[PDB]
Design an enzyme around this catalytic site. Structure first.
Site, short mmCIF file in Angstrom:
data_model
loop_
_atom_site.label_atom_id
_atom_site.label_comp_id
_atom_site.label_asym_id
_atom_site.label_seq_id
_atom_site.Cartn_x
_atom_site.Cartn_y
_atom_site.Cartn_z
CG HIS A 242 59.74 77.74 -13.83
ND1 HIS A 242 59.90 77.58 -12.47
CD2 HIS A 242 58.44 78.03 -14.02
CE1 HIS A 242 58.74 77.79 -11.87
NE2 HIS A 242 57.83 78.07 -12.79
CG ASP B 5 62.92 76.85 -11.17
OD1 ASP B 5 63.22 77.66 -12.08
OD2 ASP B 5 61.74 76.49 -10.95
N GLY C 188 50.94 80.27 -11.84
CA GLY C 188 51.32 81.66 -11.80
C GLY C 188 51.76 82.17 -10.45
CB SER D 160 56.51 79.74 -9.66
OG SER D 160 56.49 80.60 -10.79
C1 LIG Z 1 53.60 69.16 -13.02
C2 LIG Z 1 53.95 70.63 -12.66
C3 LIG Z 1 52.98 71.14 -11.55
C4 LIG Z 1 53.80 71.53 -13.93
C5 LIG Z 1 55.42 70.68 -12.18
N1 LIG Z 1 55.54 69.86 -10.99
C6 LIG Z 1 56.82 69.19 -10.70
O1 LIG Z 1 57.72 69.26 -11.47
O2 LIG Z 1 56.95 68.48 -9.47
C7 LIG Z 1 58.17 67.81 -9.24
C8 LIG Z 1 58.02 67.03 -7.98
C9 LIG Z 1 58.31 68.01 -6.87
C10 LIG Z 1 59.31 69.02 -7.46
C11 LIG Z 1 59.30 68.80 -8.99
O3 LIG Z 1 60.52 68.28 -9.42
C12 LIG Z 1 60.96 68.78 -10.68
C13 LIG Z 1 61.46 70.23 -10.48
C14 LIG Z 1 60.86 71.23 -11.13
C15 LIG Z 1 61.32 72.69 -10.94
F1 LIG Z 1 60.27 73.42 -10.47
F2 LIG Z 1 62.34 72.75 -10.03
C16 LIG Z 1 61.79 73.32 -12.26
N2 LIG Z 1 63.13 73.83 -12.38
C17 LIG Z 1 63.58 74.47 -13.68
C18 LIG Z 1 64.90 74.97 -13.79
C19 LIG Z 1 65.32 75.56 -14.99
C20 LIG Z 1 64.43 75.64 -16.09
C21 LIG Z 1 63.12 75.14 -15.98
C22 LIG Z 1 62.70 74.55 -14.77
N3 LIG Z 1 61.27 74.01 -14.66
C23 LIG Z 1 60.83 73.41 -13.42
O4 LIG Z 1 59.51 72.87 -13.24
C24 LIG Z 1 58.50 73.40 -14.11
C25 LIG Z 1 57.95 74.69 -13.61
C26 LIG Z 1 57.23 74.28 -12.38
C27 LIG Z 1 55.96 75.02 -12.04
O5 LIG Z 1 55.04 75.01 -12.80
N4 LIG Z 1 55.84 75.72 -10.73
C28 LIG Z 1 54.57 76.39 -10.36
C29 LIG Z 1 54.04 77.62 -11.12
O6 LIG Z 1 53.06 78.20 -10.77
N5 LIG Z 1 54.78 78.10 -12.29
S1 LIG Z 1 54.21 79.46 -13.16
O7 LIG Z 1 54.21 80.68 -12.34
O8 LIG Z 1 52.79 79.31 -13.47
C30 LIG Z 1 55.19 79.64 -14.69
C31 LIG Z 1 55.34 78.44 -15.63
C32 LIG Z 1 55.14 81.02 -15.36
C33 LIG Z 1 56.39 80.59 -14.58
C34 LIG Z 1 54.18 76.41 -8.88
C35 LIG Z 1 53.67 75.28 -9.78
C36 LIG Z 1 52.15 75.18 -10.09
F3 LIG Z 1 51.44 75.40 -8.95
F4 LIG Z 1 51.74 76.02 -11.08
N6 LIG Z 1 56.76 72.88 -12.67
C37 LIG Z 1 57.34 72.48 -14.00
C38 LIG Z 1 55.86 72.10 -11.79
O9 LIG Z 1 55.48 72.56 -10.77
#
Ligand SMILES: CC(C)(C)[C@@H]1NC(=O)O[C@@H]2CCC[C@H]2OC/C=C/C(F)(F)c2nc3ccccc3nc2O[C@@H]2C[C@@H](C(=O)N[C@]3(C(=O)NS(=O)(=O)C4(C)CC4)C[C@H]3C(F)F)N(C2)C1=O
Ligand SMILES: [Zn+2]
Length: 158
Positions: free
Chosen positions: A38, A62, A118, A120
């Site tokens: 993602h 992911d 940020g 992940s």
């Molecule tokens: C509500 C919430 C917190 C936004 C969301 N919670 C949530 O979904 O919880 C449920 C319950 C437990 C697991 C999850 O089941 C769903 C699975 C989600 C996934 F992760 F498997 C995922 N697979 C994808 C595969 C292909 C394409 C897109 C995908 N999109 C995904 O999810 C999306 C992304 C993920 C994310 O934001 N991760 C983080 C991060 O920092 N990103 S980032 O660096 O800033 C950035 C966006 C620049 C890259 C660490 C968490 C936070 F600390 F910032 N999400 C949404 C979330 O965490």
């Protein structure tokens, strides 16, 4: 249209990765820099030696992976089975986490989601400094993170 290494978090060193619109982390394990789909999509990892294609791409999980760039040392996988883990963030913070399953870990103290945004692709480390998992998503209620979801290190194999 590519991913760039813009910094690191010194622990072993976690890579700070950036696209044109997003920034996240990359953790090297078994000679492979793993990150999240993602953030990076299917993009290549750029650098002075030229762009390198991903060697692993799993949209469902992911999870993405490039061959570790030259100099990016791989961290040691955790083999001690610890349940007390530590999430490393892009800001060098180290957030304790209690593992509650294969892919989940509860936060000892709820953190605002903005402090985990940020990070992940960052590692969850055991008390020995070994990587037990890879930060993927956060369990969020009322904008507060109470638990995290991560890719188990066992899934970070060749
Ligand atoms: C509500 C919430 C917190 C936004 C969301 N919670 C949530 O979904 O919880 C449920 C319950 C437990 C697991 C999850 O089941 C769903 C699975 C989600 C996934 F992760 F498997 C995922 N697979 C994808 C595969 C292909 C394409 C897109 C995908 N999109 C995904 O999810 C999306 C992304 C993920 C994310 O934001 N991760 C983080 C991060 O920092 N990103 S980032 O660096 O800033 C950035 C966006 C620049 C890259 C660490 C968490 C936070 F600390 F910032 N999400 C949404 C979330 O965490
Ligand atoms: Zn360990």
């Amino acid at each position: 249209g590519s991913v760039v290494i813009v910094g690191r978090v010194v622990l072993g060193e976690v890579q700070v990765l950036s696209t044109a619109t997003q920034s996240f982390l990359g953790t090297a394990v078994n000679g492979v820099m793993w990150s999240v789909y993602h953030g990076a999509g299917g993009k290549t990892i750029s650098g002075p030696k030229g762009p390198v294609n991903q060697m692993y791409t799993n949209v469902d999980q992911d999870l993405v992976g490039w061959p570790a760039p030259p100099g990016v040392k791989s961290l040691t996988p955790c083999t001690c089975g610890a349940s007390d883990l530590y999430l490393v963030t892009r800001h060098a913070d180290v957030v304790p986490v209690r593992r509650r399953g294969d892919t989940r870990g509860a936060l000892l103290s709820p953190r605002p989601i903005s402090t985990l945004k940020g990070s992940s692709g960052g590692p969850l480390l055991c008390p020995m400094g070994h990587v037990a998992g890879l930060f993927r998503a956060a369990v969020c209620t009322r904008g507060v993170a109470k638990a995290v979801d991560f890719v188990p290190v066992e899934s970070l194999e060749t």
